[PDB]
Amino acid sequence: DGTEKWRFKTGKAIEASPVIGEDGTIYVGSNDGHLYAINPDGTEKWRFKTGKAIEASPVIGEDGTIYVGSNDGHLYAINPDGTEKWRFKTGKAIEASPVIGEDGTIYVGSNDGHLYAINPDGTEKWRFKTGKAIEASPVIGEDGTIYVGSNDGHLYAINPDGTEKWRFKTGKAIEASPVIGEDGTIYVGSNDGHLYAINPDGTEKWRFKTGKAIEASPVIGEDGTIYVGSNDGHLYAINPDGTEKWRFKTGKAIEASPVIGEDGTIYVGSNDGHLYAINPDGTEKWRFKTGKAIEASPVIGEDGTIYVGSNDGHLYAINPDGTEKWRFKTGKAIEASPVIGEDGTIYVGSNDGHLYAIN
């Protein structure tokens, strides 16, 4: 209903979305360097200290282990009771969340340029060198291939044994994770402005040009359309053959991935401050104005409500017809997408340092 259930103070901005465990514990990292475990009633279950800001969401393993990277260069494995299971050193900040494979191997990139594969027990299975920082999470395909983009401009396909399957060159840094279609095509945007479709064997299927960097991952619709925002301000809908189905203009860069509602409507925030709802045919269904850039993807609740945070400090709940359900004020920009619990509580961190639980 938009009323505050509780808030929880950390010392510094919360940059990434919280994550909810099976028992309802809410886990969130802070720029104060700690991983917090918060009980559903808003009291601290425990905290865990790292040396520098935690930039990305924690990830929970099937056994309840919570993994989190830090700007201090380590990947931490934390037991459900908040004690350290192990910590794994890389040379530089770990910017993105790790991902866990079917055999338990934990993969994560570092600003030291390497993709690390870490065994469940914390020993190194292998590392794979790229030239420059790895800014986004790796993605595991159906045969266990690990795909990761690098600031060296290449998308790498790594075999489970750590050997290179292939690498695909783009001209500029790849900032977001790739996305694999049902037929195995790998889609990835680049700061060179193009969306690339890469065949399973590493050859280019096609490329689609936008004017400016593509900051966020593409999203594939049920009929195979590939949607991607660009810093040129447009949302593009690309057919599986690489031709443009349509483009939709916003005034400013689109920094986050779009999301598709149950009826096919495509929702995207823009740095022009609006949340746009776009019909499958490319026409505007409506737009909703916030005061400042919307930096993260909208989230759709079970009843169709669209939630979005803004740099104006508010969390907005928007009805499917584009009218405001409510808004909720925090003191500073909300950088990451909110997360909805099973009872409908909406959780979101703010640059004011607090994690908010909103009814």
Structural account:
With 359 residues, the chain is mainly beta. It has one domain. 0% of the residues lie in helices and 43% in strands. It is built from no helices and 36 strands. The protein has a 4-stranded antiparallel β-sheet with strand order 1-36-35-34, with no helix packed on it. A 4-stranded antiparallel β-sheet has the order 2-3-4-5, with no helix packed on it. A hairpin with a 5-residue loop joins strand 12 and strand 13.
Structural topology:
Layout: E1 4-9, E2 19-20, E3 26-29, E4 34-38, E5 44-49, E6 59-60, E7 66-69, E8 74-78, E9 84-89, E10 99-100, E11 106-109, E12 114-118, E13 124-129, E14 139-140, E15 146-149, E16 154-158, E17 164-169, E18 179-180, E19 186-189, E20 194-198, E21 204-209, E22 219-220, E23 226-229, E24 234-238, E25 244-249, E26 259-260, E27 266-269, E28 274-278, E29 284-289, E30 299-300, E31 306-309, E32 314-318, E33 324-329, E34 339-340, E35 346-349, E36 354-358
Antiparallel strand pairs: 1-36, 2-3, 3-4, 4-5, 6-7, 7-8, 8-9, 10-11, 11-12, 12-13, 14-15, 15-16, 16-17, 18-19, 19-20, 20-21, 22-23, 23-24, 24-25, 26-27, 27-28, 28-29, 30-31, 31-32, 32-33, 34-35, 35-36
Tally of alpha and pi helices:
0
Shape: globular
Helix percent band: under 10%
End-to-end distance: 5 Å
Number of strands: 36
The structure class reads: mainly beta
How can the largest sheet be summarized? 4 strands, antiparallel
Sheet with the most strands: spatial strand order: 1-36-35-34
Percent of sequence in beta strands: 35-45%
Domains (count): 1
Radius of gyration: 20 Å
PDB class: de novo protein
Keywords: Beta-propeller, repeat protein, DE novo protein
Assembly: monomeric
Entry title: Crystal structure of the computationally designed Cake9 protein
